[PDB]
Design a protein around this ligand. Structure first.
Ligand code: SAM
Ligand code: SAM
Ligand code: CL
Ligand code: CL
Lengths: 442, 442, 268
């Protein structure tokens, strides 16, 4: 009888599915986590076009497993306590059309035995801290990496060191240390455990998909360090830029988080409303919240200029500078400037034409834009002290201009006629050269 | 003043008896435990015919002690904190007609000093885990055995390892390990501690009485292993069979608990409504709940057959088999059969007449009852390969019968005429002998 | 060294090399979690299995199953006899399937090979579930159709001079229409009194598929037991099975032993 099986549970951790007579006894009601988990189930099931295979690690009394099997999922639940599995099975038998199997076993061994594709979704709620406590953080990171490797999505509720108990001392400084080796992760909620006032964060993690409520797609590769608070995911015709505002440990000062926030916000604003006369990459999706923000754009051909420079690839500096200057002059005509023109913000296509790819540093108002013209000289010099004729003549001509006349329209016009300009080396000069050379060091 | 004494309490653990101004401050309200404890007090006081002497171990602020003294109990409360005892005494003085004494002291030393008969009831609520933590499980088991030895009843609320605190690690795997050496125990409730979502079980324990709400009687001996989930208590004219459905540790699989449940349930059903033509032992009391079930029956004279066989006692196999077969044939005539006729289910009285004593295996419907007739041959053989004439002739005659004719009426009729039946050894036979001999091995 | 890799799905020893540090060579392994990588057959698989129903592994791809037997295993794992039996069964299975008897639909063979360490066989993938799984997972089964279909194929084998030494639930696959077929031919044999022992085990099979026999299955078995033993064979077993509804009622006879001998066998 169920009555007996429930009584022999060492703990009624969860609601007993279908049996509200024990709801008052359950340590956690599970309705809040279930609301969120079912939402994520539906998103992923919608994206894949079918009911999911779900793995429930440390499934306890089966509540999540049964609740998802109720919605048509095929589920396997694992727990190392016989009493828990006995209850799960008895509950499944009350619901014979549910495709639900349960097994006694250890999560460590199950994870090792998993095969990719066997399960679409795995859930591991409030169980990994037990594995951390016995086996350490590094083994748990590797288990979670494998779990992510073999599924499409993982949902974790993770206990945290701020919980007032003795086992908190063995926890990592931040729960994200268990998952940050995985490609994609997002905080999706925080839950009351009824053990203390400290809530546990729930994360959605994937090694194969961008999983954003509005955009759910496989990616084939990703990158953290461009050219660690920013991640880029590459899919067939998209790039997803994912910025963390909230990072663990020291990592971001207050100012840096706000700048991450500012840049991504500014980039969204610009790309959703780009200026006429400028071909901006197209925007497929975007959103922001307290922890992070994201932007999905059309994927552009070409390579990042800084990579090409580093990997000594052959470049046409004339075509790169011409194309870039043309776009900067067109921005300026619409009252837009870019505050940070550097090789890692520039992409060069197969025909050696260049374009900006980060619009975080775009600005709309201001003497000005004189400083930006100055840096652009450094850019130029780093792209190559190092300027042959007629690039040196171009820079010399600009320096002879009254400063109120420095702007990108002028920079472009002089660039286009640089072959006609007088020879700098024939003049006393000589300072423009030395100031930028010191700038280009500085 | 009471105000000062209460303030100097390191903790207001309990309601301050008579002083509801501190009820909001009390860690535990105590009303739920008190409701249950008073019920048990009344049962035992009713059974003994008088007010009880009660011992309250780790009595804290005296709530249980005073509440029972209010109902006419004579109480002694023990606690090792002076501040707690000061409050208890001040409260007792506000209630001068209560027969209540309080002493500072250690439970370990008090238990050692107890004399049998001094107290009828001892209560030890949420205190033994402190003794486990400092002295270990084995010393605590011995203290609890002595406590049970010297009282009529013990009520314990026991902390458990699932509680989230550091001291949980020192607790036994299951709280029943502290008490299972005692003769009689029953779970009577589970209580919220307000420290966590994990409740503490309350047990009623005795080394001298069966304490079931409907049946409250001394017993003079008891037994676990017949001939450990089943216990038998023997009193003057009764035997109480007590089956645990819920057992600690691995001990019972789900199927085994259900079979314990099934057998005891089936036995109750049969004995409360026995078939005409069959003398069944009489039923004095019975009940079942999630954890266990019990049945109190009239006590039958005689010895269990398997004991007599083991202790090589002299037996009359003719009279045993005759009497048993007669009762089996009468059952069968009423549409009843017994699925498990074995020596440990048979009792033999002084005149060598035998009867069944376990009706867990009784069944009412089904080719059949051919299998049961087959086992009965094994029974027969074990009661003695080993069959002399005319027992061998009896079995041979049965084997020559078409199988649709095998039943206990036939078995009995052939048994009664076995001296007239043809000699098996004069026939080719020979197989019935070898099949049962292999069965009787198997 | 295999302890570092045996958790991976597919592995094969491909050579052994002199290190010039000592006379002890180092093995080179080819390992994959995604493909069967056999020189003749190189294909993705989508799942794999070790324990059927650990020296044998099965890889499942879109229209194939690859059976991979280790003859050479680490540690204690295989005695000499067991390795040779792995070798024998896989060899025997290859021989049978590459040259199957007329009158028997055998799964088709896509690739195969053997060497010192292991042997492999890639076959067409058959629909259905393994009978022992269905029994374990209490799935609904039609014992009439399973036994009928299986007996028909066994009788046809026998007519071609072939028998199967090990008819058990884990060697039988049942399709959606409840028709059954053998899927392991390691235990096929060609010569021998006989095939009387095999007929006997088939009764156990029958009983485990359900002591436990209702009419007319019990009548069928009783009829077989009344036959002189030189007449026991699968053609007879099949013929009596097809007419079992007409056969006399066993419970009306003294019997009774055939029942008890198989019940003890079915324990044993
Ligand atoms: C704190 S409970 C969480 C239960 C459930 N996941 C939930 O949050 O509602 C941890 C569960 O995981 C199980 N567990 C802990 N370690 C395990 C392991 N190594 N393998 C399988 N189950 C494990 C326990 O038996 C227990 O049921
Ligand atoms: C957790 S409180 C339980 C109080 C009370 N029995 C109740 O549950 O309402 C434990 C009490 O036992 C007392 N105590 C602990 N160890 C003791 C010992 N060895 N001897 C006497 N009292 C003890 C403490 O002073 C404290 O008042
Ligand atoms: Cl966790
Ligand atoms: Cl306790």
């Amino acid at each position: 009888d169920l009555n007996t099986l429930v009584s022999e549970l060492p703990e009624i951790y969860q609601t007993i599915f279908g049996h509200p007579e024990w709801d008052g006894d359950a340590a956690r009601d599970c309705n809040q986590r279930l609301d969120l988990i079912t939402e994520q189930y539906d998103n992923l099931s919608r994206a894949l076009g079918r009911p999911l295979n779900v793995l429930d690690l440390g499934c306890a009394q089966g509540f999540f497993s049964l609740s998802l099997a109720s919605k048509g999922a095929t589920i396997v639940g694992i727990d190392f306590q016989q009493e828990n599995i006995n209850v799960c099975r008895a509950l499944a038998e009350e619901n014979p059309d549910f495709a639900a199997e349960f097994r006694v076993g250890r999560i460590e061994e199950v994870i090792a035995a998993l095969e990719e594709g066997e399960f679409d979704l795995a859930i591991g709620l409030s169980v990994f801290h037990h594995i951390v406590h016995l086996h350490g953080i590094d083994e748990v990171k590797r288990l979670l990496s494998r779990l992510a490797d073999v599924t499409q999505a993982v949902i974790l509720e993770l206990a945290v060191k701020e919980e007032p108990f003795y086992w908190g001392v063995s926890q990592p400084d931040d729960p994200r240390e268990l998952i940050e080796q995985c490609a994609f992760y997002r905080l999706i909620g925080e839950f009351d455990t009824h053990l203390s006032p400290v809530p546990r964060p729930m994360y959605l993690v994937s090694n194969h998909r961008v999983l954003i409520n509005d955009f759910n797609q496989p990616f084939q590769h990703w990158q953290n360090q461009p050219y660690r608070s920013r991640r880029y995911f590459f899919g067939e015709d998209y790039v997803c830029k994912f910025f963390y505002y909230d990072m663990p440990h020291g990592i971001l000062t207050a100012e840096e988080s706000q700048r991450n926030k500012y840049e991504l916000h500014n980039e969204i604003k610009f790309l959703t409303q780009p200026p006429a006369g400028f071909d901006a990459p197209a925007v497929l999706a975007h959103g922001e919240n307290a922890q992070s923000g994201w932007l999905v754009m059309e994927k552009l051909p070409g390579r990042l200029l800084s990579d090409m420079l580093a990997a000594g690839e052959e470049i046409d500096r004339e075509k790169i500078l011409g194309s870039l200057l043309r776009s900067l002059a067109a921005l300026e005509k619409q009252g837009f400037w870019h505050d940070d023109v550097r090789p890692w913000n520039v992409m060069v296509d197969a025909r050696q034409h260049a374009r900006l790819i980060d619009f975080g540093s775009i600005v709309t108002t201001p003497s000005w834009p004189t400083n930006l013209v100055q840096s652009f000289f450094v850019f130029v010099n780093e792209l190559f002290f190092n300027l042959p004729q007629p690039w040196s003549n171009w820079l010399y001509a600009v320096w002879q201009e009254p400063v109120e006349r420095w702007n990108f329209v002028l920079l472009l016009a002089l660039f286009e006629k640089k072959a006609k300009l007088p020879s700098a080396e024939q003049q006393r000069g000589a300072t423009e050269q030395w100031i930028i050379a010191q700038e280009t060091v500085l």
